[PDB]
């Protein structure tokens, strides 16, 4: 079968603490003896319109930070400020720190999000970094600080840290070095994201997964060139397919015996004529949240 | 926002072992000093057409069972056979055994599945127990023994253990006492499941979640009685709505200010006239995989 899956969240639960700065309470990541968290923990619900995080960080001393690993208080001994995130050095090192790394995913790359509230893991779901650098996730108040991650067998790659919910209903945050994903800033303002395109490669890899799972009615006897299809897709707000993406689709093209350009033709007529009531993999829409690697992983 | 989420799989990863009986290798659940697993581990790929599990279990001694918790071999000291599952008592008790219970979910109830292969957790996704006692999950060879679970803060409720992939593409298994969910038997035969209905209450709770999230175009100025709507839905292969389900929808009806019967009217015209191209919560289909409790949990 073919489901939307997330990496096992186990290893990340062991790094989930509750950070507080006065009234404000948001989640933090405890890796080794450092606790990474959004810098807007030093803010009040009235110091959000436009806060100078440099002057706000002046008055805040180590004792203004309450890190609580479950029911056990860690001691903030030092505090740094990398980009939009705080970095509170603590006395104890995490005995549960797994083999980890800090990465920056690209538009189209998917990762699991362990949504936490008050330091407690609430649940896990999978999202892609939309080409407009936003995520269509599930966050409420107090979710800030929840992280996005992928796993390389032993190694947990961290790629996201939640910050805000944009006007259009979608979410935005940073990588683990504090740099925002996109043109966003950490302030309460009407800062809407641009127009969203569809990750073409991710839909082709989904149709490849669909063929592998038995749903193959959409398949036509046609072909098209990369120049031909790419120019057709561009009109429908689709991520321009490159020869790189074609190669990434390799193992799927091999498993299925269907050329990448043969698959682009079936998609081309699907864009021109619509799905007309029918369903692919039990979905009445063209799903782009699955990378070629996501599909291979489920085979 | 509104995503399909699974409970944090952490606590379950600590109970995931690799069980082997000759050539055959499938996953097992190590709770306290007992390892629960599907009884068809004692089978060969030629002893599946119709195997007498009583006579097959005769020749198999404790030393024919290789339980490997990661890289550490446990010692099978005793072996029982509750319904379709084996129960191998081991020397060491699991130091990571969480507060757990064994439950039997009902058609309509959803749970997280931690899909394991060779004792290793491969990933987690959420499914409901379809009214025809099958699950639309994601399983390959060696996935048998992967468990389905819900969490009550401290307490992990176990409700499923994978056994097979039915002809129609969907999966079927047992509860943790070995009893199959549905009319299925553990043998390799053409045993297709009946016609599937739609969990009406789960769609109403999804439209309630949709209203809470801003998508509310489907809402009409009409109403209907429980007798009226229920008889209309029955024609479209829908689970007959009971007054119990109406009460369960309570907190959602309260959050939204929309009566349960007002919501059934919008669904009634949606069934009669179709969605005509439009999308609710970014879905071009009526989604029934979310219980009222699933929706409350994300609020
Ligand atoms: C996050 O959990 C935080 N809450 C608080 C509360 C007080 C002080 C600091 C923080 S961080 C929260 C999560 C989002 C709430 C709605 N769903 C979420 O994902 N983040 C916010 O509320 C951020 C936060 C301030 C304002 N805010 C917003 O997202 C606002 N939208 S916006 C992008 O500014 O248009 C708000 C929801 C209208 C900052 C940006 C620091
Ligand atoms: C499960 O992992 C097992 N594999 C083996 C191999 C040897 C011995 C025992 C087992 S249990 C496996 C998982 C399914 C494979 C396809 N995707 C899955 O979810 N289960 C099976 O292969 C079961 C197993 C024997 C036959 N089988 C089937 O599902 C067959 N379909 S059926 C329901 O019999 O129509 C097969 C896929 C055609 C039993 C039932 C013991």
Swiss-Prot record, chains A, B:
Residues joined by cross-link Glycyl lysine isopeptide (Lys-Gly) (interchain with G-Cter in ubiquitin): 4, 89
Active site, UniProt feature: 40, 144
Regulation: Inhibited by pyridone-containing alpha-ketoamides compounds 13a and 13b. In turn, alpha-ketoamide 13b (tert-butyl (1-((S)-1-(((S)-4-(benzylamino)-3,4-dioxo-1-((S)-2-oxopyrrolidin-3-yl)butan-2-yl)amino)-3-cyclopropyl-1-oxopropan-2-yl)-2-oxo-1,2-dihydropyridin-3-yl)carbamate) inhibits SARS-CoV-2 replication in human lung cells. Inhibited ex vivo by michael acceptor inhibitor N3. Inhibited ex vivo by compound 11a and 11b.
Domain Peptidase C30 positions: 1-299
Reactions performed catalytically: TSAVLQ-|-SGFRK-NH2 and SGVTFQ-|-GKFKK the two peptides corresponding to the two self-cleavage sites of the SARS 3C-like proteinase are the two most reactive peptide substrates. The enzyme exhibits a strong preference for substrates containing Gln at P1 position and Leu at P2 position
Residue intervals annotated with topology Cytoplasmic: 1-299
Name recorded for this polypeptide: 3C-like proteinase nsp5
Protein's organism: Severe acute respiratory syndrome coronavirus 2
Residues of the full protein shown: 3265 to 3563 of 7096
């Amino acid at each position: 079968g073919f489901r939307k899956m997330a990496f096992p969240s186990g290893k990340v639960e062991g790094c989930m603490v509750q950070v507080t700065c006065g009234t404000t309470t948001l989640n933090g990541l405890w890796l080794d003896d450092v606790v990474y968290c959004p810098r807007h923990v030093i803010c009040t619900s009235e110091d959000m319109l436009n806060p100078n995080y440099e002057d706000l960080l002046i008055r805040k001393s180590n004792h203004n930070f309450l890190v609580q690993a479950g029911n056990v208080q860690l001691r903030v001994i030092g505090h740094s400020m990398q980009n939009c995130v705080l970095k509170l050095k603590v006395d104890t090192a995490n005995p549960k720190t797994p083999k980890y790394k800090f990465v920056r995913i690209q538009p189209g790359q998917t990762f699991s999000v362990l949504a936490c509230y008050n330091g407690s893991p609430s649940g896990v779901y999978q999202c892609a970094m939309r080409p407009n650098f936003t995520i269509k996730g599930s966050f409420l108040n107090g979710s800030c600080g929840s992280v996005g991650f992928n796993i390389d067998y032993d190694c947990v790659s961290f790629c996201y840290m939640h910050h805000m919910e944009l006007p259009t209903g979608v979410h935005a945050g940073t990588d683990l070095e504090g740099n925002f994903y996109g043109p966003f800033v950490d302030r309460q303002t009407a800062q809407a994201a641009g127009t969203d395109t569809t990750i073409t490669v991710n839909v082709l890899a989904w149709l490849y997964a669909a063929v592998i799972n038995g749903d193959r009615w959409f398949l036509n006897r046609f072909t098209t060139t990369l120049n031909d299809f790419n120019l057709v897709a561009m009109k429908y707000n689709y991520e321009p397919l490159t020869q790189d993406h074609v190669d990434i689709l390799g193992p799927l093209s091999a498993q299925t015996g269907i050329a990448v350009l043969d698959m682009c033709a079936s998609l081309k007529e699907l864009l021109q004529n619509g799905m007309n009531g029918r369903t692919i993999l039990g979905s009445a829409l063209l799903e782009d949240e699955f990378t070629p690697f996501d599909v291979v992983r489920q085979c």
